[PDB]
From a paper:
The proteasome is a proteolytic enzyme complex essential for protein homeostasis in mammalian cells and protozoan parasites like Trichomonas vaginalis (Tv), the cause of the most common, non-viral sexually transmitted disease. Importantly, three of the β subunits, β1, β2 and β5, have proteolytic activity and are therefore responsible for protein degradation.
Marizomib (MZB) is a natural product isolated from the marine bacterium Salinispora tropica. Our studies revealed that MZB inhibits the three catalytic subunits of Tv20S, therefore binding to all six active sites. MZB was found to bind to six sites within Tv20S that corresponded to three subunits in each β-ring, albeit the electron density was insufficient to fully resolve its binding to the β5 subunit. Initial data analysis revealed that the recombinant sample with MZB contained a significant amount of unassembled proteasome. During the 2D classification of the collected dataset, only 2% of the particles corresponded to the assembled 20S proteasome, while the remaining ring particles mostly consisted of half-proteasome complexes made up of a single α and β ring. In the Tv20S-MZB dataset, the electron map within the β1 active site exhibited clear density extending beyond Thr1, providing sufficient coverage for the inhibitor MZB. As a result, the atomic model of MZB was successfully built and fit accurately into the cryo-EM map. In the catalytic site of β5, electron density corresponding to MZB was observed in the cryo-EM map. However, unlike the observations made for the β1 and β2 sites, the MZB in β5 was not sufficiently defined to allow for a satisfactory fit. Even though we found that MZB inactivates the β5 catalytic activity, it could not be included in the final model.
Residue numbers in the entry:
A (entry chain K): 1 to 191
B (entry chain F): 4 to 200, 206 to 233
C (entry chain G): 5 to 234
D (entry chain C): 2 to 199, 203 to 239
E (entry chain A): 2 to 240
F (entry chain B): 3 to 231
G (entry chain H): 1 to 204
H (entry chain E): 9 to 129, 134 to 246
């Protein structure tokens, strides 16, 4: 039930994730990077058990690199999104990966995909996995404008994360936000 | 020659020439001698030293508490057969809780060697085993052949120069049943001495009550006289 | 002569299975073993031409237990002989597992001839250079399987060296008219007459399955007939 | 055993798999197949192996569609060609199922060449005695034409030939092939090269024209008998 | 890989399966001839029972076997191959009865044996089973008699009259030159034994031939006891 | 271990086992196929081993499905195995797709199986060439499937004993405009040309696909009716 | 279900009811619960109908397999049938709730083996199984004699299975009799009109 | 013949003898056991100066206590030493102790002769590598010799490779049971230098000691190899 | 499955199949891998029909972001080696999260070739591979040459394929112990040019800088370096 929130802009994607890793009632770390950079172009925020998320992220990143090396071409964001969807569809039926993801990738066009452990793939302008969607979707609906600037995008993502902090009972102690744009995945701070 | 292709090929004379080649590989091993008294059984052999400063390659092996085998031929195949025999002893001491009879071990190793000679892509074990056991069956000596058969003996010699040992055993065959453990060991060492081309001779001795034990080098000095 | 003699599954242009014929040659090389059905039971006698005087007296069996009612005389390649003996024991055990009853020599012979035939029918196998005479008084059956896998019930079977003369001599006696204890001297005389002088030391490994044995296989006791000869 | 084994997955004293060299020779005994890349597509042409007054030219024999963006001409054993075309179609559709994207041409060529190579390195089976001219389009590398071998070796070619008189066709292409050609120009080039190397009946020839358009996408059309006849009569 | 066309079951340069023809000659090596005649009212199969040595129990020297109660099989060939084929036809029959729930027809059993002989003639690691099989019986669905021959090649056919063994050519010639739509089971048996006796060129006794005469009354397979065989032989010695 | 391929390329790129299977076809009994405008025909000279053979029990012309039919030339047992496989493929196609397997799909499945047996180890190629008739959208279709697994499409062809002479006869006496009756007459005349002695309706099996697009084996009465004319 | 196989001096009488029950509904009112495994070997079936029919067909397969390599097809066939019934029940004890009484005639004479749902096979002179057999246990004990002939045992088995039919809801319909002697097996059906007793025996 | 597991009419596994020949075609290696330790001196064949000598290491540390030097096919020897390393770590895992030198030697030997052909899916040919396994077990250095046949023998001194026979002949009158580790290193390097076709140098030789005092199999550095080659009489 | 032990020893002790795989390598295009303190450079000569084919089919491959790979020999056996090497690099990342050591991946490729020399029914890879790259765990650029025999050796500058002996002589002559990155480029380029009579239109040169990925030299910089070397 970890809070990962994606926000797609005209030429960027702000992908944020709960940075607090936990063991039972203990917050083991306050800066755990739950967003997985499968490629230099794609950051996969993952909500789920830390072990399942780590193993799935490593598998997907290894497969993306293997596709890049086997064939001298990098996966697209639609191709990678559907590869993740195929992986999750295989898993659910046999040996399920219990991870709900937001795949944010920039391959010349911004892309944000709502993915879940079952394998529902949907390109979204904004979304979230965990209970944070119940808190952030409305704010996006209330404040997202087409053609949103990157600064307005950071403001809107900050608003969504602040809503997670304020209204979600299990408030993440912090978030790690990453900007996925033509320059790649860069970790940022929203203040 | 032209039918010496596989262990699966019969020559027009009914002979498996690859089986005969493996049997010769056994006949090229160092002299191995086995004896059997009414109370004890003995296997002895001049261990092979490939180099001057190399030790003598072990030749006597303890399969179970009252079972041992002396290999003659490819020592690697001998070790594989020793592994198989120890597995058989461990599955007979698991299924039944008692020690297997050396006759049953001879049956199993003969079956394995025959299956090696009956299916293509397999070679006969290039090693012949002088197995001595003691138990409810009494002391028993079996010379297992690569072909997939074991011959029960009161005494036997295999490997190189084994005709002299066989002659000695034939001369003293009727003495062996009443020969004590010490006398059977002495007969073994004096059948090997006729094959001499001691620190090379290793001898495993077993008895109905005495568990199989391996004596090598100076330990056998007391049995020379 | 031609190249049709290397592959067991290969047929000669005359329809001959040369590898099977060489397995039969291996059988013919071995010292004769025979079986006779008698009033009181069936007697299996195997001639053991002891290559070395050091061989254990009464050891190196050629007659084997297959079941508490079935014995197996063996001729030919002794590795193949005991392989078929153990495969017959396994076939009897599997038959008991599948059907509960104890196997009969006719269908035991059929099941083991199945392996005999598979040896020269599918590649990657060597034909069994052994003839196995399964005897059972409780089944009144004496079925001999040949290296090809051909198995026949016999009134008096025999295979090995001098097998033709041994069968001709077995033909001279109506074995069912007599019991096993009086059959033993006759069979012993037959084998001694055919025993080759070159083999000085030898033995007659006799077994019988009779009422005196309650139908169980049993080596003919030494007191009844000392198997060992010089 | 192995007395009657041909060592299909075994090297020769020269270092070349003699079964792959014999498969290549079999291809050289097969009907000529020519591929030519033009601006936004690739034209494949081939000579039917079955060409008689009675043979009914119902469907393409040497030409096969692998996907909406990939077509293949083949020289060599048409049966092995059908088997590998089925495998290539299954692989392209597997890649479409996995990635919701049309399989890149180089990756399908690498898949068929991995199959053909595996037959030359493992299992002691007969190699696929076929050479594919795999024309196709992918976003990554535009329109491509690959020449595969029974060894499992492939190479992109602007224009190439395989089969009987493949060297003559290659020389004719080298003398005549231009870059950034049009569909009509490349098709006429293929007609000229076939006519010189190869008789010459239109129904004996097969044509397929991969063409990438920004609007429709990558479209593969294997020219029908009427289209082939109309195209050849124009020379 | 050249040279396997004569030692393995692969086609030769002339397109022949030499191993199949050699399995035919191995069938000829059985030293025994079978003749089967089918009539609207019965099917009689007589196969000479040549026991080479009288030490052998003759009841075990059989070329006629019970595949099912309704389907018999007169198998001429190598005795080992004959036993393999009896066990493989019985396995076919049992598998068919377990799946389809009814006893295997002679036609389907012949098809399955032909399929096995085709796997033998194609799989180079399997010897062509040298058994010419005469399957026969009364098919219930048609309530009519079936008589099929499956050669070692697997070439299976339905026959009004068929023959196997050493005199297969001569027996088939005599059968076709004298085949009739017999009106009695005993006329079918007489023709069967007469053709077999004539082609074998030796007088027969019940000891010297196994005869199974499946009639509409006795549809179930059974080798005729020596009484009925001798009666048929006397009927054949009448004329 | 016999997993090695016995069909291998020779020094010159000639699959000797394929040529051997083709020779087996060439000595496997003449079978003709003729594609008419409104149908297709496949006949064969099914001369039995003896007059005692029952024809129905080993019919060479067989049904693959309601719309597709097959005749062969070559090893009869190989044809029976391929026929069982093709019928099983057709019923599988019906199970998965509710319709009989298309004619070219049946041909491609037979070709795939034969190629498989020409490539996998421990086996020989099927020694039969199959003439498969059936209707596609554009009309009737006749298809030759060789042991190699290569499948021609023919308007007419013979591929059995004396098939070169019969194919020359078809080249000389075939026209597209022939009807199904004309195609049957052409097939029977081709069989007569390549058969020694008088041809009989008993000795040939004919299977036709007609306007109904359903494959039907002509009964001996119908074959005799055609022969008399 | 009422199964009652009696090994007589001159044959085997296998009596059964004909009522297949799905709860209180009778899907089949004329059930052949005694399956002809072989012409002289029959299997009276109780417990799950599907499991018992699979058992019958599998035992037909196993007995034909017994005949693959032998010619004495009528030898030990009933004992082998009981053994295979028992090995299938113990092998599939988790999935097969089947009890079978296999009775008939073979080379060994008349035989009746009761393999229980647990997979316990016992050669029985008098064997009964099924829910209805409980109601007639005392009746059998009072009216069964070892010396009964096949006709006497047939009458007694009809009476006992009729009593079980009357007192058991799971047992009903007609009394399927099978009389197996050396000559063969004769099937009979005792319809409710021809049954010796009626529901009127209840309360006198 | 024509199959790997075939016996010559002389009773020899032909592939085994040919693998022995392959070992005789490999680089020389002398193993000298002395009560202080077992010393390997190995000819590193350098086809060029560009060849990184440390990467053609014919000496492999199977474990802390046991090491191995190869002769013959370097790749088959790599497989053998990989198996030996897995066996040594498995033994430490299963019995909380260093694997015996004889034990790991026997394990790799059992692996050696497990080659086969003709059976459905194993290695297809014998290892063309002979190993000189040596290490410290129970405060004692043990030196073993494995050859492709799968037979292993404990050795006080042994030689494997091209100069194996000549090296053994030189060791005949040069090897004694009470030598110091200094003397053992000197003898190993002298025998190697004698049985190689190039002047001995620290870069073309690989020296390693299973040292009892340290109880560990270490591989000597260039400095130690120079420290030994300097002392040699030539 | 098929197990015909393609690779067997000969009486003289040679694996003739390995000799034939080496011959296949020696008929492949020349590859020259050289290293500097901080950069590795690979130069493969290319034989092609410049007017009729795309020169984008490269012998140099990237097993990982730190492992560069070139080959000489059969392009299909090399493709299989490169595919397995890329899979192994990603599997090493999966199992360890650390970039696979250049020695580790070179050992893996050599072990693939070795297994093909050891696995029955498997044809030895007719490819010699130059596995180059950088290890952060060692701070050393590495260039290993894996052979068809399955033996891998690190080199300061190694060449494979046709003309490998001439290029080896050139490398030995013109190698400096402490070359700069551009000096390594010049050595590799000149060594390849020693056997090639064509410039940038033929040669293909890639390189990997310290802590960098594989970059293919342009057709402008390559030609400039070629002219500078001359
Ligand atoms: C009897 O056992 C019974 C019947 O369905 C019966 C089953 C075996 C033979 C076929 C018909 N099994 C049942 O589940 C019910 C409940 C008790 O008796 C049944 C009627």
């Amino acid at each position: 039930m970890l809070s990962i929130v994606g926000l797609q802009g005209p030429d960027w994607v702000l992908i944020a994730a709960d940075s607090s890793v936990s063991s039972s009632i203990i917050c083991m770390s306050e800066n755990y990077d739950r967003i997985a950079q499968l490629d230099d172009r794609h950051a996969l925020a993952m909500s789920g058990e830390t072990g399942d998320c780590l193993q799935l992220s490593e598998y997907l990143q290894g497969n993306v690199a293997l596709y890049k090396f086997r064939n001298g071409v990098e996966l697209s964001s639609d191709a990678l999104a559907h590869f993740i969807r195929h992986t999750m569809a295989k898993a659910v039926r046999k040996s399920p990966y219990e991870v709900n993801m937001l795949l944010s990738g920039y391959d010349g066009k911004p892309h944000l995909y709502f993915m879940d452990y079952l394998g529902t793939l949907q390109s979204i302008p904004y979304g979230a996995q965990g209970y944070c969607q119940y808190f952030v979707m409305s704010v996006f609906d209330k404040h997202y404008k087409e053609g949103l600037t990157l600064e307005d995008g950071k403001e809107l993502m900050k608003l969504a994360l602040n809503q997670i902090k304020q209204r979600f009972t299990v408030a993440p102690h912090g978030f790690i936000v990453k900007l996925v744009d033509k320059n790649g995945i860069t970790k940022i701070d929203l203040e | 020659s032209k039918y010496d292709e596989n262990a699966t090929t019969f020559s027009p004379e009914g002979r498996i020439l690859q089986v005969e080649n493996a049997m010769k590989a056994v006949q090229q091993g160092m002299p191995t001698v086995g004896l059997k008294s009414k109370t004890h059984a003995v296997i002895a052999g001049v261990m092979h030293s490939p180099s001057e400063f190399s030790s003598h390659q072990p030749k006597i092996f303890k399969i179970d508490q009252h079972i041992g085998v002396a290999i003659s031929g490819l020592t690697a195949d001998g070790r594989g057969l020793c592994k198989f025999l120890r597995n058989e002893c461990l599955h007979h001491t698991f299924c039944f809780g008692t020690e297997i009879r050396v006759a049953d071990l001879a049956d199993t190793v003969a079956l394995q060697s025959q299956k090696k000679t009956s299916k293509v892509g397999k070679r006969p074990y290039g090693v012949g085993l002088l197995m001595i056991g003691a138990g409810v069956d009494g002391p028993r000596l079996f010379e297992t052949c690569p072909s997939g058969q074991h011959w029960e003996y009161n005494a036997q010699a295999i490997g190189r120069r084994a005709q002299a040992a066989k002659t000695y055993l034939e001369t003293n065959l009727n003495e062996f049943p009443d020969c004590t453990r010490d006398q059977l060991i002495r007969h073994a060492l004096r059948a090997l001495n006729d094959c001499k081309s001691l620190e090379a001779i290793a001898l495993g001795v077993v008895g109905i009550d005495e568990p199989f034990t391996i004596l090598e080098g100076p330990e056998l000095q007391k049995y020379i006289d | 002569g031609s190249g049709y003699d290397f592959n067991p599954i290969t047929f000669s242009p005359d329809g001959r299975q040369f590898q099977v014929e060489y397995a039969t040659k291996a059988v013919e090389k071995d010292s004769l073993a025979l079986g006779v059905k008698c009033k009181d039971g069936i007697l299996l006698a195997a001639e053991k031409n002891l290559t070395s005087t050091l061989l254990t007296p009464g050891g190196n069996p050629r007659i084997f237990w297959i079941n508490d009612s079935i014995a197996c005389a063996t001729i030919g390649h002794r590795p193949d002989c005991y392989s078929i003996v153990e495969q017959s024991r396994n076939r009897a055990e599997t038959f008991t597992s599948n059907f509960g009853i104890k196997i009969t020599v006719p269908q035991l012979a059929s099941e083991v001839s199945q392996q005999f035939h598979l040896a020269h029918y599918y590649q990657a196998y060597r034909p069994f250079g052994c003839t196995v005479i399964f005897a059972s008084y409780k089944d009144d059956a004496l079925y001999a399987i040949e290296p090809s896998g051909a198995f026949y019930g016999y009134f008096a079977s025999c295979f090995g060296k001098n097998s033709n003369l041994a069968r001709a001599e077995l033909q001279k006696t109506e074995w069912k008219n007599i019991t096993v204890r009086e059959a033993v001297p006759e069979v012993a005389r037959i084998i001694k007459s055919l025993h080759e002088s070159q083999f000085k030391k030898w033995e007659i490994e006799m077994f019988w399955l009779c009422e005196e044995t309650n139908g169980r296989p049993q080596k003919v006791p030494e007191d009844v007939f000392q198997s060992r000869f010089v | 055993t192995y007395r009657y084994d041909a060592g299909t997955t075994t090297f020769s004293s020269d270092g070349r798999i003699l079964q792959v060299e014999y498969a290549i020779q079999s291809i050289n005994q097969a009907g000529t197949a020519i591929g030519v890349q033009f601006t936004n597509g690739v034209v494949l042409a081939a000579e039917k192996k079955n060409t008689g007054r009675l043979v009914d030219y119902l469907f393409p024999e040497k030409m096969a569609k692998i996907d909406g963006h990939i077509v293949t001409a083949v020289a060599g054993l048409t049966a092995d060609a059908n088997t590998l075309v089925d495998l290539m179609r299954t692989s392209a559709q597997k890649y479409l199922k996995t990635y919701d994207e049309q399989m890149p041409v180089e990756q399908l060529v690498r898949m068929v060449c991995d199959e053909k190579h595996s037959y030359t390195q493992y299992g002691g089976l007969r190699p696929y005695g076929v050479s594919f001219l795999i024309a196709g389009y992918d976003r990554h590398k535009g329109c491509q034409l690959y020449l595969t071998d029974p060894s499992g070796n492939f190479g992109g070619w602007k224009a190439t030939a395989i089969g009987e008189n493949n060297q003559t066709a290659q020389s004719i292409l080298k003398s005549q092939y231009k870059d950034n050609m049009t569909a009509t120009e490349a098709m006429d080039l293929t007609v000229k090269v076939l006519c010189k190397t190869l008789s010459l009946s239109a129904d004996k020839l097969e044509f397929a024209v991969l063409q990438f358009r920004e609007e429709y996408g990558p479209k593969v059309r294997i020219l029908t008998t009427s289209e082939v006849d109309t195209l050849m009569k124009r020379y | 890989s050249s040279g396997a066309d004569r030692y393995l079951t692969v086609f030769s340069a002339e397109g022949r399966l030499w191993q199949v023809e050699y399995s035919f000659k191995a069938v000829k090596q059985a030293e025994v001839t079978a003749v089967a005649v089918k009539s609207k009212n019965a099917v009689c199969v007589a196969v000479q029972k040549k026991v080479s040595d009288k030490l052998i129990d003759p009841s075990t020297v059989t070329h006629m076997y019970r595949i099912t109660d309704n389907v018999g099989a007169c198998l001429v060939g190598l005795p080992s191959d004959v036993n393999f084929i009896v066990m493989l036809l019985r396995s076919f029959a049992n598998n068919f009865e377990y799946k389809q729930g009814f006893s295997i027809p002679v036609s389907i059993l012949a098809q399955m044996l032909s399929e096995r002989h085709q796997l033998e003639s194609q799989l180079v690691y399997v010897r062509p089973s040298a058994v010419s099989a005469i399957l026969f019986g009364l098919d219930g669905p048609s309530d009519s008699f079936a008589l099929y021959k499956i050669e070692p090649s697997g070439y299976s056919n339905g026959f009004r009259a068929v023959a196997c063994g050493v005199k297969e050519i001569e027996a088939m010639s005599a059968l076709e030159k004298k085949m009739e739509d017999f009106e009695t089971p005993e006329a079918t048996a007489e023709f069967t034994l007469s053709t077999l006796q004539t082609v074998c060129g030796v007088d027969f006794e019940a000891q010297d031939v196994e005869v199974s005469l499946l009639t509409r009354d006795n549809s179930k397979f059974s080798k005729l006891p020596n009484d009925k065989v001798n009666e048929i032989l006397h009927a054949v010695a009448e004329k | 271990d016999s997993d090695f391929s016995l069909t291998t390329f020779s020094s010159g790129g000639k699959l000797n086992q394929i040529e051997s299977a083709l020779k087996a076809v060439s000595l496997g009994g003449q079978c003709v196929g003729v594609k008419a405008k409104n149908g297709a025909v496949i006949a064969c000279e099914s001369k039995p081993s003896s007059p005692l053979v029952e024809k129905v029990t080993n019919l060479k012309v067989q049904k693959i499905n309601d719309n597709v039919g097959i005749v062969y030339s070559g090893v009869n047992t190989d044809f029976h195995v391929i026929l069982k496989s093709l019928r099983k493929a057709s019923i599988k196609y019906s199970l998965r797709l509710g319709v009989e397997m298309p004619t070219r799909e049946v041909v491609k499945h037979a070709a795939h199986k034969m190629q498989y047996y020409t490539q996998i180890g421990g086996v020989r190629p099927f020694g039969v060439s199959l003439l498969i008739i059936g209707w596609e959208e554009l009309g009737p279709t006749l298809w030759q499937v060789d042991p190699s697994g290569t499948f021609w499409a023919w308007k007419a062809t013979a591929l059995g004993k004396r098939s070169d002479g019969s194919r020359t006869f078809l080249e000389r006496r075939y026209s597209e405009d022939q009807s199904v009756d004309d195609a049957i007459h052409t097939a029977i005349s081709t069989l007569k040309e390549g058969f020694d002695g008088q041809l009989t309706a008993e000795l040939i099996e004919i299977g036709v696909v007609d306007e109904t697009r359903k494959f039907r084996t002509l009964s001996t009465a119908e074959i005799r009716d055609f022969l008399t004319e | 279900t009422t199964l009652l196989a009696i090994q007589c001096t001159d044959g085997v009488v296998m009596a059964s009811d004909s009522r297949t029950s799905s709860g209180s509904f009778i899907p089949n009112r004329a059930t052949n619960k005694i399956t002809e495994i072989q012409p002289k070997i029959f299997a009276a079936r109780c417990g799950n109908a599907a499991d018992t029919q699979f058992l019958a067909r599998a035992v037909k397969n196993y007995l034909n397999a017994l005949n693959i390599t032998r010619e004495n097809t009528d030898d030990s066939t009933i004992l082998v049938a009981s053994n295979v019934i028992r090995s299938l029940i113990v092998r599939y004890r988790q999935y097969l709730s089947a009890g079978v009484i296999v009775g008939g005639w073979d080379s060994a004479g008349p035989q009746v083996y009761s393999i229980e749902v647990s997979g316990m096979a016992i050669k029985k002179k008098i064997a009964s199984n099924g829910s209805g057999s409980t109601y007639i246990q005392a009746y059998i004990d009072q009216n069964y004699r070892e010396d009964m002939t096949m006709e006497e045992a047939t009458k007694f088995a009809i009476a006992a299975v009729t009593g079980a039919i009357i007192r058991d809801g799971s047992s009903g319909g007609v009394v399927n009799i099978v009389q197996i002697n050396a000559d063969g097996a004769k099937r009979m059906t005792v319809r409710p009109a021809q049954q010796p007793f009626n529901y009127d025996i209840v309360k006198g | 013949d024509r199959n790997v597991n075939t016996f010559s009419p002389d009773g020899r596994l032909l592939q085994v003898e040919y693998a022995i020949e392959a070992v005789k075609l490999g680089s020389s290696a002398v193993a000298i056991l002395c009560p202080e330790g077992v010393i390997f001196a190995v000819e590193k064949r350098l086809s060029s100066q560009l060849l990184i000598a440390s990467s053609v290491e014919k000496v492999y540390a199977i474990d802390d206590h046991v090491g191995v030097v190869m002769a013959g096919l370097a790749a088959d020897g790599r497989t053998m030493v990989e198996h030996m390393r897995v066996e040594a770590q498995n033994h430490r895992f299963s019995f909380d102790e260093p694997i015996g030198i004889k034990a790991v030697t026997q394990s790799v030997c059992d692996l050696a002769l497990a080659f086969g052909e003709g059976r459905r899916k194993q290695m297809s040919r014998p290892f063309g590598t002979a190993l000189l396994v040596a290490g410290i077990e129970n405060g004692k250095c043990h030196l073993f010799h494995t050859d492709p046949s799968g037979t292993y023998t404990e050795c006080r001194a042994r030689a494997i490779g091209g100069g194996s026979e000549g090296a053994e002949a030189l060791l005949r009158d040069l090897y004694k049971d009470g030598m110091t580790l200094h003397e053992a290193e000197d003898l190993a390097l002298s025998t190697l230098r004698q049985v190689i076709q190039e002047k001995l140098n620290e870069n073309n030789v690989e020296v390693a000691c299973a040292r009892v005092s340290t109880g560990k199999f270490e591989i000597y550095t260039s400095e130690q190899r120079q420290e030994i080659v300097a002392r040699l009489p030539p | 499955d098929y197990t015909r032990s393609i690779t067997r020893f000969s009486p003289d002790g040679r694996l003739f199949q390995i000799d034939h795989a080496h011959a296949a390598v020696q008929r492949g295009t020349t590859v020259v891998a050289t290293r500097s303190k901080d950069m590795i450079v690979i130069a493969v000569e290319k034989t092609a029909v410049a007017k009729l084919q795309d020169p984008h089919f490269s012998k140099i491959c990237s097993l990982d972001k730190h492992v560069m790979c070139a080959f000489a020999g059969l392009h299909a056996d090399a493709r299989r080696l490169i595919q397995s090497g890329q899979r192994q690099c990603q599997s090493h990342r999966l199992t360890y999260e650390d970039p696979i050591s250049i020695e580790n991946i070179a050992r893996y490729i050599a072990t693939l070739q070795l297994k093909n020399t050891q696995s029955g029914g498997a044809r030895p890879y007719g490819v010699s591979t130059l596995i180059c790259g950088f290890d952060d765990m060692t701070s050393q650029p590495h260039i290993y040459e894996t052979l068809p025999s399955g033996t891998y050796a690190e080199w300061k500058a190694r060449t494979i394929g046709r003309h490998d002996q001439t290029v080896m002589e050139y490398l030995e002559k013109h190698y400096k112990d402490d070359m700069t990155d551009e000096e390594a480029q010049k050595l590799a380029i000149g060594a390849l040019l020693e056997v090639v009579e064509n410039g940038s239109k033929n040669l293909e040169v890639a390189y990997m800088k310290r802590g960098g990925t594989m970059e293919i030299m342009a057709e402008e910089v390559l030609d400039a370096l070629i002219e500078s070397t001359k």
